[PDB]
Design a protein around this nucleic acid. Sequence first.
RNA 1: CAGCUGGGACUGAGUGAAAUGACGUAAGUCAAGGAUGCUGGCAUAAUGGUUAUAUGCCGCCCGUCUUGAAACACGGACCAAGGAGUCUAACGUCUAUGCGAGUGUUUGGGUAAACCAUACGCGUAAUGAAAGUGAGCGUAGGUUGGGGCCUCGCAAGAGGUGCACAAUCGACCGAUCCUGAUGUCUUCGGAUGGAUUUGAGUAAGAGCAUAGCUGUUGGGACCCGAAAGAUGGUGAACUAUGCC
RNA 2: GGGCGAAAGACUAAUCGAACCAUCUAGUAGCUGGUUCCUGCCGAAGUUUCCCUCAGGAUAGCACGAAGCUCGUUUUAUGAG
RNA 3: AUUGAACGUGGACAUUUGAAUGAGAGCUUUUAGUGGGCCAUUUUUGGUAAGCAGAACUGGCGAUGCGGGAUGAACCGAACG
RNA 4: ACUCUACCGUCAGGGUGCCCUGACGAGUAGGCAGGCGUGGAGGUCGUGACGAAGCCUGACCGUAAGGUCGGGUCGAACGGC
RNA 5: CAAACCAUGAAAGUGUGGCCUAUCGAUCCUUUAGCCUCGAAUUUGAGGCUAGAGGUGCCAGAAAAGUUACCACAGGGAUAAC
Lengths: 121, 116, 142
Amino acid sequence: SDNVYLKLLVKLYTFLARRTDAPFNKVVLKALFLSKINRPPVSVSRIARALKQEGAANKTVVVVGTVTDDARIFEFPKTTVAALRFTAGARAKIVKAGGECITLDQLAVRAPKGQNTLILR
Amino acid sequence: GKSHGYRSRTRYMFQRDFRKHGAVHLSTYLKVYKVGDIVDIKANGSIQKGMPHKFYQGKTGVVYNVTKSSVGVIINKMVGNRYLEKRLNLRVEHIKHSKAAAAAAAAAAAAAAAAA
Amino acid sequence: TKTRKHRGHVSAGKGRIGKHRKHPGGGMAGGEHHHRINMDKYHPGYFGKVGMRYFHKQQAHFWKPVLNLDKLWTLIPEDKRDQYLKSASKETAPVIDTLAAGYGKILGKGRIPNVPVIVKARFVSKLAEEKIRAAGGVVELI
RNA sequence: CAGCUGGGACUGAGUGAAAUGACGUAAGUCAAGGAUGCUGGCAUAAUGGUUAUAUGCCGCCCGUCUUGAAACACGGACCAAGGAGUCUAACGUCUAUGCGAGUGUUUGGGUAAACCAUACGCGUAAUGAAAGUGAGCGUAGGUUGGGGCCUCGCAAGAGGUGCACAAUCGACCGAUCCUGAUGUCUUCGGAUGGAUUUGAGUAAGAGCAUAGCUGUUGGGACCCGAAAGAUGGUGAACUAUGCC
RNA sequence: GGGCGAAAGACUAAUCGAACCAUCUAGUAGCUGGUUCCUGCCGAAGUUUCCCUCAGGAUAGCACGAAGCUCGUUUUAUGAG
RNA sequence: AUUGAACGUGGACAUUUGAAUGAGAGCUUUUAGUGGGCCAUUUUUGGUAAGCAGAACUGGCGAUGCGGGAUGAACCGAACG
RNA sequence: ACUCUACCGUCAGGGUGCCCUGACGAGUAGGCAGGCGUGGAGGUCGUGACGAAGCCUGACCGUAAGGUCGGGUCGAACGGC
RNA sequence: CAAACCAUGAAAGUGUGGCCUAUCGAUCCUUUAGCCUCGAAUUUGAGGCUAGAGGUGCCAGAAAAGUUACCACAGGGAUAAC
């Protein structure tokens, strides 16, 4: 196993973790190594549920694997998504809803601390 | 050599008792259980329908609950494979009564702090 | 193709030394009993018959479109291709499928949101007609 | 006690560091923490080297079967040629991955290894000896309420419509609640373990394609050792029998 | 599978109880034998439900490989020679 | 009738200061192996005439250094880069 | 073994570059990882007749794998990347 | 445990025929009764619950008998003379 971008993201995450840690720096770090299913392709239908009607849109989603973009996510639910791959639909419909599509690279740049964070499977 | 089933090997566990022979009195007959009553087991050929198994005597056990009414009730006990949820069915007469001493340790311990 | 492990052991493709046709058990196996093959007390084998074969399910059996009421609906509050009475979609306007194929219903499940659309299809399923009628619609012809 | 007596173990010496220490002194030592030199076994960039070789002591060498052969089991004069799991190809985990809730094709066109096209696929239907339906890539089961339609008969009552909506139960997601430590405050916020309650979705398998790999069914099919069938030729040159 | 017998399946190119030559054919062998780099991590088992089944193999016992987490010492009794 | 449980509600039942979580055992699952073993200790059914033959329990070898024993895997001491 | 202290093997945690450093390291199947390997090749410059592959012989690092330099000699072939 | 549900009993009452305590046959089939699924289409051919026929005794089941020495081939103390 060697994803050229992702194994360099291990050495990025450990450099931040062993100084200013986060609970999202713990969990996601193991799942940079681990296999196919352990990198979940989360749909924005399960984000539309979990991240804002039930759970809080204060808590920002740190997606482990990729982001697929189910349905056409509306102007009512929303969160700020960061993931590995970001698709054309996620570059459109998440922006329509009211969030940024970022990346794990930039989570180290923004705020590795985990003040208001969740993951999603 | 031997055949299985009824009386083979542990003939005593099938058997009644020589001292306590004859029809069974109204002791464990009318004493029905509920949740968490610790009990024992020993059979006989006096109670016909609802006789427990011989291999699963020897072992002690606790009553889960009495399910609905009196008959068709269960006793928990391990079988020597490994630790697994295993029980045994029977009716009331075969079930005994044992150590309700241990759980009264907590109520004895709680007479502590007010001795200041 | 692990030439290193395979040629310098010769166990790859064999196992232990004298394993010949006893090990795969010939090649195939039959239905009932036979000696030293891979049959034994197996759970597959039985029944045999492959396919859901019946005289109704063969030639001239017309196919259905892939067409949910809400899966159709999701594109409608964006695109203004379709008409608006309440809303008023067509069957084969947001959807492909039911171009060539014989009939065209509007189908399946999901506990329906309050969408008073009116669909313009050929037929209708039992599924969609109850759901959409409760919401505030009906089937209309094409 | 260093009176005396034997060793492992540590500090230090031109020039000349950094971090963690103690006691004592006009002195310093212990303790730390920074830094060797040649052969030796022997596969790929060494000291002046190959090597006849007394005397003495240790001292029983494999590829394979089996619990078990230096053994009196098999197998080399000696050297060179040839050769024993493999370029088919199916399925399933997984690596890598353009691109994903729609994507990715092919023949071929042709700007020729490019680029364009998108036919069409993508895990796929319960079940009643004989009296229907076609289920949203495929999407059912168990239990129950409401309602639409038809027939017989005295609307006494009997029977399907329960296909479907939906009510309602389940793997499970996500929320909720509580214990101790707990950032932060009598106010919010983070994480963990267990249990109750409550909201909601997906055949919960939540993408397809591809370079490639694995064990195996198939493929030159790991290399070697047989008795044996069908079909078409040629032998009465020798030889059993015939006849004159 | 015919030729042939006072018989012995004697006899037919040293092959005759089914001539010989060539092809399909590299027939096939449920059995036996042989089979090519190294180190490190690391490493069991000879047990079983069961079979028109026996030098085998579906399953189970025991440790392979890979990811994520998992004791008891002993105290009160209860059951059985 | 009553039994059984959960919630509301009162009481019994430990606290200061600094820092933070240990496994020697469970469960899930892909690409193999075994599926035929030896010996010593001890008791059983059984020929204590015999290594007749069967059932239970335990250690070492199988996959183990080195020392002891003239020669001898099991025993004694015992663990190996 | 016991025992002193150091050294060799993979991996963890603290903080990169990796270092401290715990517990264990007899070994056959078997799996994974890592390292050495031929023919060939997109590449291909570099080396060559003022002396290429090769033949033959010497030096010859040290992890088990077998490869660079140098000498006598060749008369055209072959590697940076 | 509750309903179905007849005859008995003052009632309480306890059992899906039995004192604890061996006692038989599948797929394949055969043929019958009970009656839920069908080719313009009114019928009907053909086809899937359940229960029963029938010494498959190895009780977990293929019509029915063999010397084998002219002789060939591959294996075996898995097995014997010894």
